[PDB]
């Protein structure tokens, strides 16, 4: 269902929760081993993976090198070998049932580093670095191409996007978005790369825009009516769901729903608690 692992509401969270819109209710499961915020979630071969993040607690602020693996009928987390480096505000994509870990920070260091994980093998292997250092980068998969979108290089927030070609192991810059976006929600809906909300350096954004690969074009769609960055994002029902985040004053519990064929947003639920920086994925 629509799960949300980790997050932050005054401290990094252990929560693992589900939400289905066909039943309108939530299923709770095994808390994260280590609390995490700024993580990313994915699903490979059924299993929900949690990559990077950090544990921002009253007693520390540790960037997470770790990849951990949840089994929906084993309901157990098990550690899968750590990454090259810790990656707070990481972005992840899934090609070929393999996981790419993109960017993120470790302390002052803003990564361009990228690396890939192999679920049959439990191994991480360094790959070609991005052209840009990116934290809060959003990541998407289209035609088994991997897109790194937006983010923050440590000084500037980014509207640039760049494409990873796996069988040439290359990054090439593509057309920039119309809006600068760091910590936006980036997903794939229809066959457009969606980028929703984020932070442009001044305000959280309610605007949303989508990339069409054939025309190399970004187009703005209906905006959410709550600006939000550090949101979770996923598509269920062929419909967009955005989960929590931060709006400058409050940790949102609002969950919004975008219908593409009417191009309208509508509130589906409120989360159990307002929180930001969750990892989302579905299996």
């Amino acid at each position: 269902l629509i799960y949300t692992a980790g997050g932050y509401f005054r401290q990094s969270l252990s929560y693992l929760e589900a939400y289905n819109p066909s039943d309108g209710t939530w299923l709770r499961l095994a808390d994260l081993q280590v609390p995490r915020s700024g993580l990313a979630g994915c699903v490979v071969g059924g299993l929900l993976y949690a990559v990077g993040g950090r544990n921002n607690s009253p007693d520390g602020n540790t960037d997470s090198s770790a990849l951990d693996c949840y089994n929906p009928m084993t309901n157990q987390w098990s550690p899968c070998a750590p990454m090259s480096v810790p990656r707070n505000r990481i972005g992840v994509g899934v090609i070929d049932g393999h996981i790419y870990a993109v960017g993120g920070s470790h302390g002052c260091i803003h990564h361009n580093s990228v690396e890939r994980y192999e679920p049959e093998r439990d191994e991480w292997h360094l790959v070609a670095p991005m052209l840009t250092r990116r934290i809060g980068v959003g990541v998407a998969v289209l035609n088994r191409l991997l897109y790194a979108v937006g983010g923050f290089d440590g000084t500037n927030r980014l509207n640039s996007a760049e494409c990873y070609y796996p069988e040439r192991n290359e990054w090439r810059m593509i057309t920039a978005m119309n809006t600068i976006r760091s910590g936006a929600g980036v997903c794939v809906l229809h066959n457009c790369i969606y980028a929703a909300g984020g932070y442009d350096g001044q305000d959280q954004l309610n605007s949303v825009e989508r990339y069409d690969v054939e025309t190399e074009t970004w187009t703005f769609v209906a905006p959410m009516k709550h600006r939000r960055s550090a949101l979770g994002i996923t598509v269920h029902q062929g419909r967009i769901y955005v989960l929590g985040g931060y709006d400058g004053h409050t940790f949102l519990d609002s969950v919004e729903c975008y219908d593409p064929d009417t191009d309208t947003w509508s509130e589906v639920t409120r989360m159990t608690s307002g929180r930001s920086g969750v990892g989302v994925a579905v299996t």
């Binding site: 932050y8 915020s37 700024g38 505000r89 809060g136 910590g183 932070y199 550090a230 931060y246 400058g248």
Partner: peptide
């Protein structure tokens, strides 16, 4: 702290 995440 990061103003994008509020932490």
């Amino acid at each position: 702290x990061d103003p994008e995440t509020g932490e």
